[model samples]
Target: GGIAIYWGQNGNEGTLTQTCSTRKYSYVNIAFLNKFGNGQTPQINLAGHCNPAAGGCTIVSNGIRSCQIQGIKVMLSLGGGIGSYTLASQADAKNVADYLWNNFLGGKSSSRPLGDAVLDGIDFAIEHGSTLYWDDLARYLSAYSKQGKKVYLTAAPQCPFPDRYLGTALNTGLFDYVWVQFFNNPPCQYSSGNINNIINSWNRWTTSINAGKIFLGLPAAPEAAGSGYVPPDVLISRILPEIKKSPKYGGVMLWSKFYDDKNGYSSSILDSV
Candidate 1:
């Protein structure tokens, strides 16, 4: 019930770290994005940097090992913020699921070493102004989680947190849970150190339909939260309690992994406790 599912930013500069788990979170999303931040042509299952793990953030710099110890999920996120044109071009509908599930995820292609680890599942996405998001996403979900077997299908939909994404994702029951944007935008700045603003936002969302499918996200890494660094002390004491009372309260999703508290080695990610 603590940090349930955290979207550990996996980029050249971003990746889930060890402290991410100690924050008492459950799932750790290892960024498996196919595109680069510089807006380069996307790669088809590059697996890019070689590390450890099956299909997630490599076990490098202790962050990888930390996640292993936590026994949390290390999921791959597909279709990112840049655009979906490439993802759409990558696989066809007939074999999309198997392609993504086995090829890229099962060490079949470029992501071999990283894809070899015991994987959790795929995070089909169409970031921001998602194009064909629902359509493409539904197809991918259908292909991946078809067998179920404890596989998770999480999404990074624009949050307060949804009762079910867009009545479409909700109506169809396509996703397992969602990550909210407490600091992603905001009223630009909510004041009270923004951490508390995030809490208030979570409360408003939990009161909605998919209250159960919610994950409280903190700007533990991204600058979107104005410095992207919320003092950890605030999380354990102030934030956790606020989220606990939410309707479907899943957990926390701190942006990226490295935050103001860079103790990916030993410190706790919670603000209080």
Candidate 2:
């Protein structure tokens, strides 16, 4: 079991190299290649960390390589809570995949947004948009792994039984990691100081999804999300123990590096995870 933390969304979260240097996370998802699809040329957003418009974001490529050298799998996360992206058809899906491969994955491009660092995988943080064609996108991305450098596919879906936007995509079973968001959604998330809701939903995800692993994704701090903040102690004692019993349990995933840095949530639960 290991921890996965998302970086790049908040500038104050610190550098990508710094996030991996803490040695607390096994995976670091560089978040929000926020713009693409629907005829858009595609864009990568790292907030104040760097400016993709000026090609300044390439500096993080060194940090990415450093993290990978230390054995931390660094990935490029696509889509976000806020972004303009939607695959209009199977052709659009393939085009997006081609763009991702040439720009981020193991392919050639003179203007790779993140520079020369070939990312370990892709994380689907698709929160909005039509559900159609996502499975096609998944297939397109997965096909690249056949080139020898495996492109690990991952997804972050809301805790609902069948996520409205990603249900079909996830059913493709191509994802290596399925970090189901256990925050924001009150019905299937931790609520009222009880674990029943989360437990029931966890069972459903583990039993139903054919993904390689299922992680319990939560907000590292109360401010990270509207709700579903599990205190480190409570998570270690109550949540982890129960979820660890599931055969598909991978580990825990924090919302972002910013909150984890502020609260030291990952450090508190590191040993147990």
Candidate 3:
């Protein structure tokens, strides 16, 4: 069971580099290489977690190497909550995918952000902006994987019948992993001790998406999100076992390294996972 976690959104925890090396998870997504539109370079601002003088890029490079050494997959998360990110057309999507590959992934470029420390893949946590042309982006990235490289693509769509932002892209069946966020949305999310609806939606994902794995995305602790927070014990005894019956069941995705610390890194249910 592979576990995924987001890092470097808030400054309360520590540097993204530190989180990458220390967090006990299979995947660490560098949060929000956000803000891209009209075919420009993607912008990244990790708040106060990383500073310029401390060699932020070098820190990231070293951290990526460290995580890879320990067999942890590190991916760059794109399209966070705040940003004007959008792909107007297929050409723009292809261009953005190329830029991502050249800079952060295995492809070569002079201005690579982490200085050639290639990430495992890309995670499309598309929470905002236009939903159009995302299928083209997924197709281009899937095509990019053919050049003797494994370009893994992942998506984090809301837990609904069809995701508003990434439904078309997901229908392409190109993504390797799909970790649907089962929080915040009351319709399908676990709210007021409701689990049946979310479980129904989980079943929908297994049959609907052509993914190698599907994870139950949850907030590690109650305070981590606005709603849909399940206790690790309940997750182990009630939710996870039922979900694991599916062949595509991967594991769980915690919101961040910070909240996971608050819950002892899901140590209570590590064995079940």
Candidate 4:
């Protein structure tokens, strides 16, 4: 949910825009908390962000007040596909989670880091490799249940071999839901083929995994560049029909409303669906 405008580090037209713009966005997803602390402990990810809005809550609250959308839910995405301290398994994940809950959500950071929004839960997009990767994420989130808090546990995982278990053991019990990237279009000529690949993979996962805990993500055009995404119509025409047939059709999660919506995704393609 966090955005880093690493635009050449050169002064381009200030790309300094909030993750969720008021003109649109029903709910803003403030991606990941900073990997390296922006400054303080729990190290403000957006760096003194949410401060302007008195925490992100204010920002989204103002957005809601501004209209053009419904209620805004503040969700914290713990790790990315690259993994975070949660996957470290060195026990730092516990500390990081503790810090996030304690300071950020607890009281130390701000009575409202979200500004004016309510904390929905968490999104754990941790990848494979270390033994602790997904398991550690589960451990951290298990705290939510024990605390009697109904927090969302969501992960954006790689839709590949090792991660096949993602929908199964890794998240079935621990996470509330997940969006598997049908994006990163795996190497193949027709991107639609990848859709079939995804379906097959999902079948593999659902055969043993929980279908209730899955969502499909369409790769925004840019992300599809190297990953191998075809045109929007193709994805809609080819991929959609197939996925729609399956009951695991939890709905598609688009990467960016800003980019995708503008690029004919929702306008003619997804909206047509």
Which TM-score value belongs to model 1?
Answer: 0.65
Q: Residue-wise lDDT of candidate 3 within 142-251, one digit each (tens)?
A: 78778877988888888986999999988888888888999988877786566898899899888988888999898888888898888776787788889999999998
Better by lDDT, candidate 2 or 1: 2
Q: What's the lDDT of the predicted structure labeled candidate 4? A: 0.47
> What lDDT is reached at residue 204 by model 4?
59
Candidate order by lDDT, highest to lowest?
A: 2, 3, 1, 4
- Please give the lDDT score for candidate 2: 0.92
| Candidate 2 RMSD to the correct structure | 0.8
| Candidate closest to the true structure, highest lDDT | 2
lDDT of 1 by residue, 37-112 (tens): 2234334332344434454433442554557666766666765445433323323433455555554343255554
Reference-based TM-score of each model:
0.65, 0.98, 0.93, 0.68
RMSD vs true structure, all candidates: 5.8, 0.8, 2.0, 6.0
Q: Give me the displacement of residue 246 in model 2, in angstroms.
A: 1.3
Clash-forming residue pairs, model 3: none
Which candidate, 2 or 3, would have the higher TM-score against the true structure?
A: 2
What is the Å distance of residue 187 in model 2 from its true position? 0.7
The true-versus-predicted C-alpha distance at residue 260 of model 3, in Å, is 1.0
Q: Specify the poorest-scoring 10-residue window by lDDT in model 1.
A: 37-46
User: What is the C-alpha local distance difference test score of each model?
Assistant: 0.51, 0.92, 0.81, 0.47
